[PDB]
Amino acid sequence: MAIIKEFMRFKVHMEGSVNGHEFEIEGEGEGRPYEGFQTVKLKVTKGGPLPFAWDILSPQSKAYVKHPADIPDYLKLSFPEGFKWERVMNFEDGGVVTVTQDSSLQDGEFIYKVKLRGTNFPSDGPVMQKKTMGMEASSERMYPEDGALKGEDKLRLKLKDGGHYTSEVKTTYKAKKPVQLPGAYIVDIKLDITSHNEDYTIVEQYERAEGRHSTGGMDELYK
Ligand SMILES: [Zn+2]
Ligand SMILES: [Zn+2]
Ligand SMILES: [Zn+2]
Ligand SMILES: [Zn+2]
Ligand SMILES: [Zn+2]
Ligand SMILES: [Zn+2]
Ligand SMILES: [Zn+2]
Ligand SMILES: [Zn+2]
Ligand SMILES: [Zn+2]
Ligand SMILES: [Zn+2]
Structure with missing residues (x-):
């Protein structure tokens, strides 16, 4: 019977730094993995208040995608051992975030461990000036490659003064044991900040994520 229950909790810890500013975050989350939604509460436990936009941290929980x-x-099939991911975010103004993550299932809940580093953000840019205010919905394109599941997305952060600040995101998600990979497909995602204290040292998020077949092009109908 099911390792991954219809309701699952998780704990997460991140160690990170952005433009040299070190911090740690601890959080706990919950959700319904087969329905494709989840929530999380994060606390900046060291290094707060952060001198940069929360939004670059928000997308740093793929067991909860409805398929x-x-x-x-x-990624569900990878449990209980779990999976790892590695991510590169290349922001339009040259800032770069790298992330590594381990996901496992221990004592009936998911355990997430994240390490993150951001560098090369302009001192006067929207990240270091805290001028973003959430992200738009996106669609992560998923495809098998090099024995892992890759995702590619273009994240659009909303600017306080209107307009968007974008990042090209590439992630590799790999099960710790060999598990059947899917063909290419798409995951529609929306992530909302649902609560925060004044200095964003406590932040709550809600995400909905659902996989579907790729829309495909007219060209494919002639194949
Ligand atoms: Zn049920
Ligand atoms: Zn600092
Ligand atoms: Zn609850
Ligand atoms: Zn310290
Ligand atoms: Zn735009
Ligand atoms: Zn709260
Ligand atoms: Zn706010
Ligand atoms: Zn205020
Ligand atoms: Zn189908
Ligand atoms: Zn084509």
């Missing part, structure tokens, strides 16, 4: 039965749910 139709005909798309292998590779």
Whole structure:
């Protein structure tokens, strides 16, 4: 019977630094992995208040993506051992965030460990000046490659003064044991900040994520 229950909790710890500013975050989350939604509460436990935009940290929990039965749910199937991911975010103004993560299931809940480093953000840019205010919905394009599941997305952070600040995101998600990979598909995601204290040292988020077949192009109908 099911390792991943219809309701699952998680704990997460991140160690990070952005433009030299070190910090740690601890959090706990919960959600319904087969329905595709989840929430999390994070606390900046060291290094607060952060001198940069929370939004670059917000996308740093793929067990909770709803999948139709005909798309292998590779990352759920990886449990209880779990999976790792590695991510590069290349922001439009040259800032770069790298992230590594380990996901496992221990004592009936998910355990997440994250390490993050951001560098090369302009001192007067929207990240270091805290001038973003959330992200738009996105669609992560998922595809098998090099024995892992890759995702590619273009994140759009909303600027306080209107307009967007963007990042090209590439992630590699790899099960700790060989698990059947899906074919290429798409995950529609929306992530909201649902609560924060005045200096964003306590932040709560809600995410909805659902996999579907790729829309495809007209060209493919002639194949
Ligand atoms: Zn039920
Ligand atoms: Zn500092
Ligand atoms: Zn609750
Ligand atoms: Zn310290
Ligand atoms: Zn289908
Ligand atoms: Zn735009
Ligand atoms: Zn709260
Ligand atoms: Zn706010
Ligand atoms: Zn205020
Ligand atoms: Zn084509």
